[PDB]
RNA sequence: UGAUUUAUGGAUUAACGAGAUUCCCACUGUCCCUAUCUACUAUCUAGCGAAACCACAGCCAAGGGGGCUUGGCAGAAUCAGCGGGGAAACUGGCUUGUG
RNA sequence: GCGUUGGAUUGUUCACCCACUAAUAGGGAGUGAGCUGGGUUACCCUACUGAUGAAUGUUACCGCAAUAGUAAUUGAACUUAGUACGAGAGGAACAGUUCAUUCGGAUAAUUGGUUUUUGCGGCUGUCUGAUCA
């Protein structure tokens, strides 16, 4: 979470383990992300560290630019593609699963965003909400 | 009249609040100290309104309005729309609007007279904003930086943009938008001033990390003290070259 | 609280039943239930599929257009809370539904007039 | 970071008990007892509707 | 790593270090063997013990070394003043001593492990392990004194101030007991005692300040006597190397005063001894407690002395005192303006800021490109009402305070209602129904609806009178 | 590092080490010298091999035994060198080589769809026109109703039946034109 | 050795030894003590679970992220016909425990409780309590001898009740007894209050009200004999360990040649008692009120009993309690409903609560329609209806 | 508290006769030394 | 024991193989993380009806260089699952942090 | 008292790196029954987990409670506070309030999964003369 990361986190569904490739929505030139780790987890015997929306994750890049590929960096989840629950009653999900990059203090690296983003993520984090064109 | 104040511990204020010459809007996070911080400056002169959007707090970037009109996207509940019309006077026009994209504060920087708009907007929205505000609406990107409403702050006094804009863009946009503007930084180099700070013609708000030059230059370009009509800029040109 | 119409069912989705979907093209689609959602995922045509209003209204079953229908669109102009205004609106809705029932009933009655002569020649 | 069982927490919660969050209870139970008392009177007049 | 280093966590003395590490492995590791177990288990147990203690030792010695600042080529300022102050030779031999120590324990660790891999029996291994530990203990016993010396330098370096020498600074040097404490107090929140005795300030004292929307530091010296420039105490030596190293203005705190009753010949010969180190220093003298004397009554001999000082090419005098704010402020303004001059003559010789500064200086003007004026709207009410007073017996209630007073910060519910306008406030607190059987009411709600349902009543009248509903 | 680690991020380290190997090789490689490098066989392997054939004369991959045989330890020799006094800066920066082929949000017109063997696989969405004279020609038939007014607005939601329907309509529009 | 990753077991030992309880009536072990200055007041109730449904609510929670927003949450609903009082027991203090010394009954008794105290009913002459009512049916004074015995002695009392199960849908036709303790002082007041509460009903609104946190104790939801993997959270064995696979594979060696008690060998799950505490009431409806399910916002004339009725339970013609959470129990099971054993502290227990809408949609499938009226509108006309 | 394990005071015969045999070894060593 | 040598530019090896392997794309309940459904048995009953094995039989801890000593408990009779048992580790108080 | 993670790895990994986590401490009794190497009658009874049972005049109901067991844990935010403290740089705190992690107990309103209700439809081949079924 760290400096900048605002608020608390509600319990949302933990769809994405480590090692699920997802797309990237910013205008850095990075195409896709590959998670290697999640931050702020617990631990349970032979659990995988599970990722969700609204989470700041340690993750590498596979396709993209040569400068940013294949090195671990902080990333926010924005799109799940597995069904989660709102507290105002509805269940929902996106077409495909997606996350963006940013620094450890939560500040955005790119200058744009594609596609819709998570409401809880944009509420929890300022800067994706600053760079967000689309939410829900 | 520039003031440092922090939503709850974030220096990013225009994520969480909006300011017109005629009204102000605040989120509901926690305790009534942010509201009180603004009420200390404004009093009962105009409404500072607690609100929500979709049960979400992000009003300074989800919403967009001026003293003449105000918008919200689709996803607002009608209870909150009722609450808004009960909160505000009947002078200002109000509208929920249907779009592909909803991030109104992100996508519009505007003042009471004139607005800049993102280029991939839909034309019915382009029509409606000009109908409701009665303002002139302009479709451009700022140095190729997109979501111009997030990367720009604006008022009738002056203008502000993120610092990486070239001078030709600064000039052409100033001639377009009809106030002076500066490519600048806020809150320790935070390029995103549309989200980092908030302005009306007679108040300016930042977070605590903002420095003395930064508050000075924005105080100069927006001329906050009655009267500082470019006089403090003409004084503090020298600190600009000495520091940066 | 907001009831919603189903994108595939054209049926009411109450709160906490049924499922939202949202596209990369930033379009919410509520779905009444599994049937509605699974048909959408199957990329069917409700205009073809029979039991929904999307087929029926276009295929000339129950009346698609009326002045009673143009009362209940969205209001993006949220005026100011008069209690007497709501006191009128409620009774108005109570009567609007009654006349809607009668208009539907007459639609059906003129839809199904003419059974008896064809039964008469059937024998 | 603390337990359930902590001495600090429990004396704190106990002033908080003999502060506000017993006041509502003392109101609550008296309201409740009043309703309970009058329901017997409803049953009495129901009995007396058979007495007549 | 710089900037008043703190990450030099602690050094024990040697005996207590041995107690630390030995009881640590004794506690953590297993401590039990029976002879009847097998010899791979036994060998490997003692192997486990020795390698555990070895890693603990050398990790502690790594915490020493990587903590310690490695003075060679860190900044010439910090490096050289440490060499003046903290016995450079003694320092380096101590670090050499522990470096050979860590190499030694690694060596003996590896060799005893190489021995122990074919250790046959229990008495053999037990004697061996005790023997090796005594050897590393014995070298640790050889090194008592330098580590304690380093404990003291750890403490002192933690007490050291924080300086970036690169930045805009104002060195303040004067004679002892001239009113520098009053000066730094009057400009800056730093309460150094003003008391009239010789060595009052013993080390370098900082006060940060601001002017004209800038940041400045002010570095006052402990004060200097003659000790004439051939051999010298480390206090004046670090003052000298501060003059030598820091690239900012230098300020002489002259006492043209009755106080500081060392004689003016002492003062001026001290000045003359420090003439040659005024090469490139941007020296600025200021005369203190001048409002008491008004020194135009001064005699010609003490006048030609100050001309004997003013013989130098670069010099500038101001007049100030320590009873009012205006002169201390104005000489401070002039000193940072000297610093602006110094920074300007340093900066305008690279010609590199010219390419990137025009993007920030560029205020745009529209040329206003229209016929219609767009005026900034400012209401009357913002002008009518008063600015809020923080400290007032009677002032606006600031409902932060109400939430605190009822109340609390995260316990109290604001009535969101009863803040705004209705036709009537009584049914402000009423409930909207918001729901019907189906057909939610907010898509129905508008005016003109009595007229509309009456229109529909005309329609159903038109159909029922013709008898449409059969 | 010690062999068998992870093969992505160490692929970054060996790739950048090899790029520095290029920067020193082009400095001080004699003609028909020897440029011998260890590599983790990575996604960049095609790029570096392609540009090594683009830059050098003799480039042989060894494929050695006597390694772990579980990591992609691929050792390569580059012998032969032009000693260029004129250098090509497009083939040292890894920006131009990274072209990304597509196969074969968007809202387009429909007359181009009538107009335009792989020219069919890209029709994602369309926009509506009502007033143009060719639309007025196309008015006087089954069009403009029975889901056609909506199937101009979106095409993802059709499936293969109304794909065939819309293609038959394209035949209709084509013979009209 | 020391097994190289130390981890928690699969299960709780505190609810062991795991066995089927004795009866479907959950028995209560302890009650809130007393305020012997406050008047008399009951400490518990009986109820009958029927079904679960859904609520939206405006949550007044300072500090929250759902202060003054709509939030959905799931409730259950217990039937609660009012409850009739039949008798008292007196209880004393020993240093062996509390001990019953006297019970007194209330002189006119229903066939329902007689159906309880007989087990094969219809084959009876139904001669249950006759000579006790005849021991009353005089000047009496035997009753009074016992009652004053209890006034003199008998630090603590509890009261005997039974339900009005005949007023329900339910096919049991046998009344459930209980003992309920009290929280007034004034033992004579307790006992005379009971003496006048004889043959008198007690509703729940006389006990409970909104914004309260209570405790449910009940018995649960048999599954029969269950293997270990389904029963506890034990892992499954990989494939082809001989002599069975959904089991504990290796428990050890010939050291230990003796089995432990903490490794979840197979047996029952379910039909155990449990207690789940600090469940928040939201609503108390009264069966005499038409459309108790009509919330404050909605103002559709409608009752909670949803279309298709409740599932494996009928529709309500009685009061109801509406609590959040999931009470232990299954459909058409009993519960014993206690209050909270202490003065609670949580500011969650305080909210002058505003529920926004009750769902009444049908639970025999994917309910979409609250009422047949709305269904009849939305569908319109049919072949059969005319 | 957690009242921890004790050592016994039980006899544990092997140690008794080990003590006796050890004792005789000690006294033997004493006689071997005692001439000096 | 068997593809190819008197300047051929053969001797360097195209192809050949129920042989082996590295990276990349695809795939999936191997896994996260388990859940569910099916036929049979398991179970019970009517009838038929064995064998292996068997000194006795059995409740546990310490002790004695399964039974005895000292103690803890044990309440008739019994059913179904269960897989832990069923006539290679202190000479001598061993071992522990300090040559 | 509670808790102590997920991965990559061998012609001599030797002691490892990668990250996360509040931390990712150490040993015994363990699989001489499943697995890895350059490799020299578990059917008798036992106890355990579940389940019945005559006995005390009978039968039923309501309870006590000897005893045995025992479970909660961990972190973050809001103010408090940009306060104390600090030249600056930096910057806590118990009281109040709310969320999550882990673990456990129950639960099926809703969402997802699942189908022999083989419920309703759909389909291949064959058979009942074809259709229907």
Curated annotation (Swiss-Prot), chain B:
UniProt keyword list: Cytoplasm, Initiation factor, Nucleus, Phosphoprotein, Protein biosynthesis, Ribosome biogenesis
Q: Which SUPFAM superfamilies match?
A: Pentein (SSF55909)
For this protein, what post-translational modification is recorded in UniProt? Answer: Phosphorylation at Ser-174 and Ser-175 promotes nuclear export.
Q: What does this protein do?
A: Binds to the 60S ribosomal subunit and prevents its association with the 40S ribosomal subunit to form the 80S initiation complex in the cytoplasm. Is also involved in ribosome biogenesis. Associates with pre-60S subunits in the nucleus and is involved in its nuclear export. Cytoplasmic release of TIF6 from 60S subunits and nuclear relocalization is promoted by the GTPase RIA1/EFL1 and by SDO1. Also required for pre-rRNA processing.
Annotated HAMAP family:
eIF_6
Other notes: Present with 18600 molecules/cell in log phase SD medium.
Q: Which family does it belong to?
A: Belongs to the eIF-6 family.
Q: Provide the protein name.
A: Eukaryotic translation initiation factor 6
Origin organism is Saccharomyces cerevisiae (strain ATCC 204508 / S288c) (Baker's yeast)
Swiss-Prot record, chain E:
Q: Which residues form the OBG-type G domain?
A: 168-340
For this entry, list what GO says about its biological process: assembly of large subunit precursor of preribosome; ribosomal large subunit biogenesis; ribosomal subunit export from nucleus; rRNA processing
Q: Does the keyword Nucleus apply?
A: yes
User: Where does it localize?
Assistant: Nucleus, Nucleolus
| Record's GO cellular component terms | cytoplasm; nucleolus; preribosome, large subunit precursor
* One term of GO molecular function: GTP binding
* Keywords for the protein's UniProt record, in alphabetical order: GTP-binding, Nucleotide-binding, Nucleus, Phosphoprotein, Ribosome biogenesis
The superkingdom of the source organism is Eukaryota
Which residues participate in GTP binding? 174-181, 220-224, 288-291
What does the record note on quaternary structure? Associated with nucleolar and cytoplasmic pre-60S particles. Directly interacts with RLP24.
Note on file? Present with 28000 molecules/cell in log phase SD medium.
User: What is the documented function of this protein?
Assistant: Involved in the biogenesis of the 60S ribosomal subunit.
Which family, according to UniProt? Belongs to the TRAFAC class OBG-HflX-like GTPase superfamily. OBG GTPase family. NOG subfamily.
Q: What is the official name of this protein in its record? A: Nucleolar GTP-binding protein 1
The portion of the full protein included here is: 1 to 470 of 647
Swiss-Prot record, chain F:
Assembly state and interactors?
A: Component of the nucleolar and nucleoplasmic pre-60S ribosomal particle. Interacts with the snoRNA-associated proteins NOP1 and NOP58.
Record's subcellular location: Nucleus, Nucleolus
Q: Which residues of the full protein are shown?
A: 122 to 329 of 841
What is the protein's given name? 27S pre-rRNA (guanosine(2922)-2'-O)-methyltransferase
Q: What does this protein do?
A: Required for proper assembly of pre-ribosomal particles during the biogenesis of the 60S ribosomal subunit. Specifically methylates the guanosine in position 2922 of the 25S rRNA at the stage of 27S pre-rRNA maturation. Also methylates the uridine in position 2921 in the absence of methylation of this residue guided by snoRNA snR52 at the stage of 35S pre-rRNA maturation.
Q: What is this protein's gene name?
A: SPB1
Q: Which family does the entry's similarity section mention?
A: Belongs to the class I-like SAM-binding methyltransferase superfamily. RNA methyltransferase RlmE family. SPB1 subfamily.
Catalytic residue positions: 38
From Swiss-Prot, chain G:
Q: What is the lineage of its organism?
A: Eukaryota, Fungi, Dikarya, Ascomycota, Saccharomycotina
Tell me more from the record: Present with 450 molecules/cell in log phase SD medium.
The subcellular location is: Cytoplasm
**Any one GO BP annotation for this protein:** rRNA processing
Family to which the UniProt record says this protein belongs: Belongs to the universal ribosomal protein uL3 family.
Provide the positions where the record notes the PTM Phosphoserine: 23, 155, 296
What protein name is recorded for this chain? Large ribosomal subunit protein uL3
* Crosslink position(s): Glycyl lysine isopeptide (Lys-Gly) (interchain with G-Cter in ubiquitin): 38, 135
Recorded source organism is Saccharomyces cerevisiae (strain ATCC 204508 / S288c) (Baker's yeast)
Assembly, per entry: Component of the large ribosomal subunit (LSU). Mature yeast ribosomes consist of a small (40S) and a large (60S) subunit. The 40S small subunit contains 1 molecule of ribosomal RNA (18S rRNA) and 33 different proteins (encoded by 57 genes). The large 60S subunit contains 3 rRNA molecules (25S, 5.8S and 5S rRNA) and 46 different proteins (encoded by 81 genes). uL3 forms together with ES39L one of the contact sites for the signal recognition particle that targets ribosomes to the endoplasmic reticulum membrane.
PTM Phosphothreonine: at which residues?
Answer: 102
Outcome, altering residue 242 to A: Cells accumulate 35S and 23S pre-rRNA precursors. Cells display defects in translation elongation resulting in decreased translational accuracy
Q: Which PROSITE patterns match?
A: RIBOSOMAL_L3
Knockout phenotype, as recorded, reads:
A mutant confers resistance to trichodermin, a trichotecene toxin produced by plant-pathogenic fungi.
List Pros-methylhistidine occurrences by residue: 242
PTM entry text: Methylation at His-242 by HPM1 is required for proper 60S subunit assembly and promotes translational elongation fidelity.
Q: Name one GO molecular function term.
A: RNA binding
One cellular component term (GO) for this entry is: cytosol
* Primary localization class, coarse: cytoplasm
